[PDB]
Amino acid sequence: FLGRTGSSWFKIFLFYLIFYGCLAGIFIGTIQVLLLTLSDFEPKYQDRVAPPGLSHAPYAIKTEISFSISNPKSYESFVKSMHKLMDLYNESSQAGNSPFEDCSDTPADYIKRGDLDDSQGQKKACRFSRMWLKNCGYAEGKPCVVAKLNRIIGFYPKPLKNTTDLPEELQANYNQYVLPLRCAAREKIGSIEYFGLGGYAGFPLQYYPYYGKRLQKKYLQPLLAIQFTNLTQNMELRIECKVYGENIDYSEKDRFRGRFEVKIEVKS
Amino acid sequence: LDELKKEVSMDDHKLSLDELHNKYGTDLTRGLTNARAKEILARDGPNSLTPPPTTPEWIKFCRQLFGGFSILLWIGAILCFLAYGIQAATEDEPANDNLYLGVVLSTVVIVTGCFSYYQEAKSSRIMDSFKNMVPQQALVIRDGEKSTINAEFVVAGDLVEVKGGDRIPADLRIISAHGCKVDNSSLTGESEPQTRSPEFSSENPLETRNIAFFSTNCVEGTARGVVVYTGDRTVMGRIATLASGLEVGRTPIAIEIEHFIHIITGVAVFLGVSFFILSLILGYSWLEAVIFLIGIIVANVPEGLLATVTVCLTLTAKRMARKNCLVKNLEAVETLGSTSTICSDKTGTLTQNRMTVAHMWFDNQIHEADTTENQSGAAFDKTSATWSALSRIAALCNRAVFQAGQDNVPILKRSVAGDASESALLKCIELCCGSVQGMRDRNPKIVEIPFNSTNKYQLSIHENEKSSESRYLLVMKGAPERILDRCSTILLNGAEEPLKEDMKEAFQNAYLELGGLGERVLGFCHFALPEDKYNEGYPFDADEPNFPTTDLCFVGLMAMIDPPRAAVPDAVGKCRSAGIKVIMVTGDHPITAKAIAKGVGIISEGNETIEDIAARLNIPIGQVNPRDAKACVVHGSDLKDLSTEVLDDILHYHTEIVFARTSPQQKLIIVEGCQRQGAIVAVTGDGVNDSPALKKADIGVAMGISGSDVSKQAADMILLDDNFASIVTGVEEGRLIFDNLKKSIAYTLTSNIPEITPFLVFIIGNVPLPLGTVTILCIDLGTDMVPAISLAYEQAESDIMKRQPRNPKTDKLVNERLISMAYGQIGMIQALGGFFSYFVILAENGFLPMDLIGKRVRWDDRWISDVEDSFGQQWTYEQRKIVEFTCHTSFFISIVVVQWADLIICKTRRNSIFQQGMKNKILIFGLFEETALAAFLSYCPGTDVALRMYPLKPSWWFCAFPYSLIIFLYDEMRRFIIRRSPGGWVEQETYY
Amino acid sequence: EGPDNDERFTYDYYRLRVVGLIVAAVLCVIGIIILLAGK
């Protein structure tokens, strides 16, 4: 033929069949032992998610949400993702004492449901009403963005203490139980309005620590609705929403490390 | 074009002096007119040689920039700029990826260009050396007056004059001469002075006395002649053009390189476009379809391989430089290993090029002297009183002297003023009797008759050094038979005795044997003149026989020859044991050529020519079956009337071939004949008459000390110490480097698979990219470099000089067996070890292997800063990318770890590491430096930006260890099978 | 610890780099030693 005879062509096939078969069987074996060394409830390493990311619902083309108020299908793209998220926080999804629980309607302290063990059933998560998100189809004019803190197993978000000076200096400082979120731009051509649990501009600490998908399915993380009823129009406004805390940090590279990058433009 | 120049020349030495003048419109006495000479100048053109048109270095450099790998790397470099252009227009990408990768790849092409350019070097100044043989000026007779003119202004027809010490300015017809002798070594390779006279003495113009040639010099006397040829039209000017004009051609090693380039280029374009369409079918945007292709290019092309080859060659050439063997062309480092036929000059190559005493006949006994340079033989006789009598004649009846200031150099190597035979005798006595000058001071010469054409003898009368005599001793030497007709007694073991027919017959026997050995034989005799008949003041007349020259006492015979170099016989046998055919090709006479052939082992004992059979059986040569003769001796005059097909039959039908009295073109023809049969041929030589053959040879080797400038220009290799044993070393080195290149190539190729497979699974699996493009270049250009080179220092696995020369048609540098092992077996194991570490990194950070399938879409999505892992955690864009790049880093390090084992297995093709050992210090160096480089690239701060290399946790380093070990075991088991059964299965499938 | 389990999300990449570079250097020196056993 090309290389060899039929007899040789066969033998080279019988070899590579057994050979690659063995190699596949060995590869799988090493994957088995790897998995055997891992927990079902908690990942081996968590230093790469460490400082929590802050992500929002409006799917930004490039950290930007520009549209026209005087146009219907101009914002119907951002309403798709906005709906996708809030559709999960339905009351019909949170039914019965299992696996949900009614928690303080005001920001409270942490809740420990034991260890990362299966020695108990599904760890009961705090309910969250999308109805706590006042004012927010969504904002056809002047968007109503929804913030979110990235989930990390066993992470206890710790707010800053009012020992020294603060950006939003001491205003509504629920020091003991709220992780604040203050959006900014100089360039003050807007109108910041925050909505959340208990009416505070933060995340209620009663939703922590997260026990993971395996130990807490259907779990709901707290949301923080933000509305920009800015009196300006037809210009790119670089708005940055920042979260503050002891376990919260940022990076010049990762522009989502505990903060937002939104470029709103109501070009109408 | 040069087929005309490969033919024997035609001449006009047969014409009379007068007749020759009519042909050139010339005067025998007055010479040309100033006006007629200038007319002929403009007509024929200058008496000069024009160098052939060369290829500029520009075109030579750029021709390498387009050879398979460079072509693919160019397509990659441009395709980078393509994707970059498409980006800069569409979505403003502030990145530098495609732009920088395009710059990097273009640089890789340029630098790789320098390496191949360095390897494909051609240092040739043939025509320049020939031009150096034309004198600046010549002496001509114009308008009846002699004047010096620019030799280029010399034309056919003018009257030229030459004298001892000057170069022949052009081909001349001798019309007048006085004691003129010439050095025709340019045409023959033999430096013995040849007389020139107006008389025609041979039909063959290269042998007649009435022609003098350009490229030669007058050694003594004076001559006048008419110019018959000028410039390019001279006999050796044509040889110049032939030699300088010959197409170089591709070396065996070069052909091998291009061959695997085709193979690897083939699989590259195959998988390249095979997966380019496979991606579009899967619905991949052309934006991405090209990005994957660039990666495929980089994965398939072994970026550092061609440069490795060059370095391995260079390092092999450095070792040979250290044995006095200079390599002018890097590729010639290997040709000697692939050589199946050596065509060797005799004089100054196989031989020392110096008349040396070989045997002596005295006391009715043949004695042999030591002919070797360094005198590696033994003594023959010292005791016999006869010896001292013969020794005295050899010293006394001798007019040769050592040049001043030689006392530092060895006797046999020092320059001597005199003819070759007298120098030989001088050096013979000086060696075994001490200072000859002393013997010539103790015995003052009073009268002598120098060797005469008519007398055929030379005699001398000396004052006997003996005090009790202080009388007159007569000594003489000459033609053995002439000396015999002048002897009455023979000095036997001390005492004289009558010359009976018995001893006279033993003389003839001794004389015939020595002459049969191709040796020049001389007779020696002396006579103690009677005291009473010769007073202490008796005057001797040299002009008229004033003393007896008959009834003298015969002392002995001495024989001499230009002997082989000490190492030559043994080197010839070694070449022949390695299955190399050795042919002699010489301008010298057949009797001498044949005798040295037997001396060095070109013609082995018992082997006969058709002429030998005929003489032994006493039958006509036509009655001899030529197939009964494995040896042959072909004279150039017969070679001339043979067609190439008939020359091919001679080459095919004889194992032991001697081509004697060959011209320079004839040497070229014999070389081409050998090549025509498909053989790789080496030429060894030292003369300008070897230049065409040396050029045409696959590898020409010139002698460094004895070699002429031309020969060393025409060669690929120079033996700087004239050590012929270096050929044996050269062939051995050549074979070793050929095997080691295979090892180094397999090693380099093996790591291509773990660079290809990640890109494929990236498409077919939709997982995060396991390894990056930059990461690949860190391997092929970084870590693999020193290890790959180090394989050039591997010792032989067996006695390589015991095997036959490779068949260049069947035995390739890269074959299917190499690809099967490198790509199909070992590289495949490396790929898995890479993937394993990849799955380990991701799974330990929260992305278990199961959830990875079909996630790249969301993984690469720059706007999703919340991807969910297996444990329910959310990752930003840059966070997961850090883990991904950490995966690139450990996959990279996995390659390094699996290349550890590969380096050790590529060490040997057959033998076990437990047999070959670990005595390669460069290889071990490679292991340490490779690992140091990898660690540095991972842990050095800032490398995460420039190369996207991230720090690895200690446990990460050990992921591929079990795969590294399986490689070592697998290959060790496999080679154990090879050795345990030379049959073929494992052998014919995987044996590189 | 409980709410004070910050060490769980921390890794000393600084020490690892220091050690990694020490090792790389020493492997580089060791290599020179073995190579220079004859040049």
Ligand SMILES: *[C@@H]1O[C@H](CO)[C@@H](O[C@@H]2O[C@H](CO)[C@@H](O)[C@H](O)[C@H]2NC(C)=O)[C@H](O)[C@H]1NC(C)=O
């Ligand atoms: C989650 O809540 C949303 C609230 O808008 C539900 O949307 C409803 O969709 C139905 C049918 O398309 C409409 O008739 C209603 O007007 C919507 N709102 C309400 C309050 O009922 C959505 O269907 C819910 N999703 C799930 C899975 O239950």
Ligand SMILES: CC(C)CCC[C@@H](C)[C@H]1CC[C@H]2[C@@H]3CC=C4C[C@@H](O)CC[C@]4(C)[C@H]3CC[C@]12C
């Ligand atoms: C990533 C995976 C799926 C690709 C696997 C590719 C396999 C099938 C390839 C890789 C190397 C290949 C072999 C390389 C060498 C030879 C020897 C030659 O004389 C005949 C073909 C043969 C035997 C090839 C057959 C196919 C082969 C085994």
Ligand SMILES: *[C@@H]1O[C@H](CO)[C@@H](O)[C@H](O)[C@H]1NC(C)=O
């Ligand atoms: C939000 O909606 C409420 C009614 O639910 C209305 O009273 C109020 O004006 C709205 N706020 C703004 C800022 O438009």
Ligand SMILES: [K+]
């Ligand atoms: K050559």
Ligand SMILES: [Mg+2]
């Ligand atoms: Mg010679």
Ligand SMILES: [Tl+]
């Ligand atoms: Tl490569």
Ligand SMILES: [Tl+]
């Ligand atoms: Tl490679």
